[model samples]
Target: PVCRHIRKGLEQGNLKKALVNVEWNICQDCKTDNKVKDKAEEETEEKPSVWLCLKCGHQGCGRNSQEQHALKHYLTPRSEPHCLVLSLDNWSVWCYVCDNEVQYCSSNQLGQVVDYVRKQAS
Candidate 1:
């Protein structure tokens, strides 16, 4: 039922699924705001290496840091991946950014991320 509701919300484009806040002031490898129309041209001169996670929208340094962040999630054993959410079936992880499902693996495993209501219930 929960997954169904989530799916419906997604279908209707009403789901606020992914939302990661990045500390822009502290991020050393920040990239230009890609939301701008001239993102490609703006980044052409600097070649910003960092990337924002397509799932939770977390701005990360690069592949290496992103990989490290994922690993950290796994290593914690109790904490879930920072930018992804596991489906109700627990079989697949969804990237909030691209709204695509990522298969379970060391790189994509997510712990239970409780929604607001669920958090209150617990």
Candidate 2:
């Protein structure tokens, strides 16, 4: 189901910018070499993944990463309210607040985003 935060964002008219500025490549936290304690085991046996903050274009490591910075990014009071995140691994959108998948809008915001990112691949 589409989460209310997504719908609320869509209603703002300026929400298109959220889709425009996603950091589709590397995660910001990972780039800084931030480590989450006790994640050494998890790091040794998994593929790299990142989550994109749809609201502010911040990128962070996924839950399985040594940092789980994507989740931590959501909980930070400094970063305003942001619930929708796009998974780089599966190209899916998720809402942290509702703990559910964020459904695509009929207007095709995500579809267009996927198409744009895929073509930009080298």
Candidate 3:
């Protein structure tokens, strides 16, 4: 099911698709806020889950066994709620507010962003 917050976040980015700037496999919070090491060696040793905030293109570590920076981005109070995050590992968007996984290709607005990331990721 689609959540209203998904529409709220996706519609505000001007539908530009240009706002979806990402640092490939990097998570901003892990590297900057937490000062965690992001190295090629780390990639081979463990595959960390990273998420991209749909509203701000903020890449952060997942809210699982590692860190909760991805969850933090959505929880932070701002002009708009950063509720939707696209998972880099799974290539799926999850809504924090609704607590559901978003369906991509079904939505005209969301499909574009999903497609954009898919292309770049490949």
Candidate 4:
């Protein structure tokens, strides 16, 4: 449900949920500074990519961080394609199971996502 920019994708029937329902999750690395993370080290072609758990707000260091905190977190989840991963620096969203970028998220789409969760839970 991670989104912004507009309802373009949603209207197009691409996006179907909102990250606002995610509850703003925070991870250990982000627990210190709730604000968007700033690059703490020098940049290189290998700059670590920083990814956030749009589902729970768990911040994980990415390629730029030279760490796979998010990757590890991603591997931790069994029920997936449900959680959205946000690139803090890239400002992008991806669902591993869906293998697609998350788009056009809004409250109206929240119900669909919520219903999916309920159905899957049952």
What's the candidate order when arranged by decreasing lDDT?
3, 2, 4, 1
Q: What is the lDDT of residue 71 in candidate 4?
A: 66
TM-score, prediction 3: 0.75
TM-score of each: 0.23, 0.64, 0.75, 0.45
Among all windows of 10 consecutive residues in model 3, the one with the lowest summed lDDT is 34-43
Candidate 1 lDDT, 1-122, residue by residue in tens: 12222331122111123332333312222434445454334444433223323233333343233333332332344432344433322224445433465543232212222232123222
Q: How many backbone clashes does candidate 2 have?
A: 0
lDDT of 3 by residue, 67-113 (tens): 67788777778887777788888888888877888875645667678
Per-model CA lDDT versus the true structure? 0.32, 0.61, 0.69, 0.46
Q: Write the per-residue lDDT of candidate 4 for residues 24-83, one digit (tens) a residue.
A: 222345334446454343244334555655455455665444446676666774643324
Worst 10 residues of 1 by lDDT: 7-16
What's the CA error at residue 109 for candidate 2, in Å? Answer: 4.4
Question: Which ranges of candidate 3 are over 4 A from the true structure?
Answer: 11-21, 34-45
Query: What does candidate 2 score on TM?
Result: 0.64
lDDT, candidate 2, 3-90, per-residue tens: 5576422222343454454345567666555454433345465455777766655677787676788888888776356666677778
Query: In model 1, which regions exceed 4 Å deviation?
Result: 1-45, 64-78, 83-122
Position 3, candidate 4: lDDT = 45
Candidate 1 similarity to native, TM-score: 0.23
